[PDB]
Amino acid sequence: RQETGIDDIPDVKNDFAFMLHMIDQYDPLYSKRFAVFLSEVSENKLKQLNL
Amino acid sequence: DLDLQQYSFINQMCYERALHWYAKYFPYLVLIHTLVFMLCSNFWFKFPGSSSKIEHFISILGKCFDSPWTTRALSEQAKALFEKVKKFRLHVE
Amino acid sequence: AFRVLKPWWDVFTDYLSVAMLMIGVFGCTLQVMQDKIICLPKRVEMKGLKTDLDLQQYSFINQMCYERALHWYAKYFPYLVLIHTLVFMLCSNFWFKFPGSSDILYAMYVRQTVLKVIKFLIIIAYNSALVSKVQFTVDCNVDIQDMTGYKNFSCNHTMAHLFSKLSFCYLCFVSIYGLTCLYTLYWLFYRS
Amino acid sequence: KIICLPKRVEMKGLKT
Amino acid sequence: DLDLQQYSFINQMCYERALHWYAKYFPYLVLIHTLVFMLCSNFWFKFPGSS
Incomplete structure (x- = not known):
């Protein structure tokens, strides 16, 4: 959120939080790439791109 | 003076x-x-x-990481994948 | 066709049957090589008790x-x-x-x-x-x-x-296997 | 392996 | 004058x-x-x- 300046993607539930921790233990960059699709503004932009 | 059978029995x-x-x-x-x-x-x-949840998460994470549009946003067909992403986020939450 | 038709109780039964199968074959082999009775004539400083029985008689006995x-x-x-x-x-x-x-x-x-x-x-x-x-x-x-x-x-x-x-x-x-079936039996006679 | 012994005859062995 | 068993034991x-x-x-x-x-x-x- 502080890096890409995206204020969406606030938090996750217990399962998602723990399994995100597991992924970070495996690879933080996978977490970075996976987080992108939670950004609502990203969805707005890609819907505009499709339009 | 013990035969073989006795030894095996012992x-x-x-x-x-x-x-x-x-x-x-x-x-x-x-x-x-x-x-x-x-x-x-x-x-x-x-x-x-x-x-089922684990395998679906693997598939969705692989697809999302593989998407170049994610990195583009960091700077097409993923629009349909946004719906899968939100559905998975809601369901597995 | 091969996996979706396996509920957790069915998988448990299949794995129990596999394990008991391996137990069964293991026992069958153990009978194959080491299953040998060993016999001696019962009724009779310490010395030996030679019975003057040559090998063939021991085998027949x-x-x-x-x-x-x-x-x-x-x-x-x-x-x-x-x-x-x-x-x-x-x-x-x-x-x-x-x-x-x-x-x-x-x-x-x-x-x-x-x-x-x-x-x-x-x-x-x-x-x-x-x-x-x-x-x-x-x-x-x-x-x-x-x-x-x-x-x-x-x-x-x-x-x-x-x-x-x-x-x-x-x-x-x-017992465990039966219990699993019992659960399935309950699933067949509690929910219909 | 049919195993055979001679037949017609405190006890001891029967060394044949 | 040792039977075979004693030899194996030794x-x-x-x-x-x-x-x-x-x-x-x-x-x-x-x-x-x-x-x-x-x-x-x-x-x-x-x-x-x-x-």
């Missing part, structure tokens, strides 16, 4: 009685315990109820 | 008392386990091996579950008595005189105690 | 007592050293974080 009897059971079963015992370890590790994926 | 004394269930326990596990596997796979079935399907599945439950019940009921029957040592009073001169013999079976050990654990497995 | 006893442990364990020792070696060497690939 071996059998004293082997069953005198020798302790732990020495008689240690390899099988260790094998059992390592099987228990392997099975308890594998049951995390052999349980279908959570296995 | 071994076989005679091995047939006469060692219990038929004790002899056939590995065969018993192997045959029962093969029957369990075949009755499990007959659901898909039947050409016609590849609401009669539900009735056939109910019949198979009932057959498995009854098999478990009978197995427990008779194994409970039979397990104590096998003994490590054994005594046979066989009229082998005029051939060796002895008549009362003490023998011991190599796998006997080992078998009993395994046999005891086997008992528990059976 | 063999095993003097085996365990007299013969030095190096002779008894040398092959197994070699196996453990080799397995540690190729495991340590393969750990470069087997470690997913840098994999």
Whole structure:
């Protein structure tokens, strides 16, 4: 959120939080790439791109 | 002055009685315990109820990481994948 | 077609049948190489007790008392386990091996579950008595005189105690399997 | 292996 | 005038007592050293974080 300046993607539930921790233990960059699709503004932009 | 049959009988009897059971079963015992370890590790994926969630998460994370549009946003067909992403986020929450 | 038709209780039953199958084959081999009765003439500073019996007589005595004394269930326990596990596997796979079935399907599945439950019940009921029957040592009073001169013999079976050990654990497995079916039985008679 | 012994005859062995 | 059983007994006893442990364990020792070696060497690939 502080890096890409995206204020969406606030938090996750217990399962998602723990399994995100597991992924970070495996690879933080996978977490970075996976987080992108939670950004609502990203969805707005890609819907505009499709339009 | 003991024939061979007597010697074999003595071996059998004293082997069953005198020798302790732990020495008689240690390899099988260790094998059992390592099987228990392997099975308890594998049951995390052999349980279908959570296995479905795990496999779906693997697929969705692989697709999302593979998407170049994600990196573009960091700076097309992923629009349909946004719906899968939101559905997974809601359901597995 | 092969995986989705396996609920967790079905998977548990299949894995239990696999494990008890490997137990059964292991016992069958152990009978193959090390199952050998060993016999001696029973009735008679310390010295030896030479019995002046050449090797052939010992072999004849071994076989005679091995047939006469060692219990038929004790002899056939590995065969018993192997045959029962093969029957369990075949009755499990007959659901898909039947050409016609590849609401009669539900009735056939109910019949198979009932057959498995009854098999478990009978197995427990008779194994409970039979397990104590096998003994490590054994005594046979066989009229082998005029051939060796002895008549009362003490023998011991190599796998006997080992078998009993395994046999005891086997008992528990059976109960577990039945319990699994019981749950499925409850699923067939609590929800309809 | 049919195993055979001669037949017609405190006890001891019957060394043949 | 020792029956074969006593000979085998003597063999095993003097085996365990007299013969030095190096002779008894040398092959197994070699196996453990080799397995540690190729495991340590393969750990470069087997470690997913840098994999």
